[PDB]
């Protein structure tokens, strides 16, 4: 379900469903969530930090 994504000595947990794009740059992985009243907040996540489950879609399913 959740993301554990460190900031700078704090690590945010962010919702799988929330994430509203998600794009493979090379060495990166920079996503753009929504978190209220149209609002969007940046993250990123590194390619061995992200796991299993944002992974498997876009080199599997469609």
């Given at each position: 379900?959740?993301?554990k994504?460190?900031?700078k000595g704090?690590?945010?947990?962010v919702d799988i469903?929330?994430?509203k794009?998600?794009?493979?740059?090379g060495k990166?992985?920079?996503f753009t969530y929504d978190?209220?009243?149209?609002?969007?907040g940046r993250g990123?996540?590194?390619?061995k930090d992200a796991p299993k489950e944002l992974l498997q879609m876009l080199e599997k399913q469609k």
């Open positions: 379900a959740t993301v994504f460190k900031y704090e690590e945010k947990q469903s929330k994430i794009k998600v794009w493979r740059v990166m992985i920079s978190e209220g009243g149209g609002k969007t990123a996540v590194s390619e």
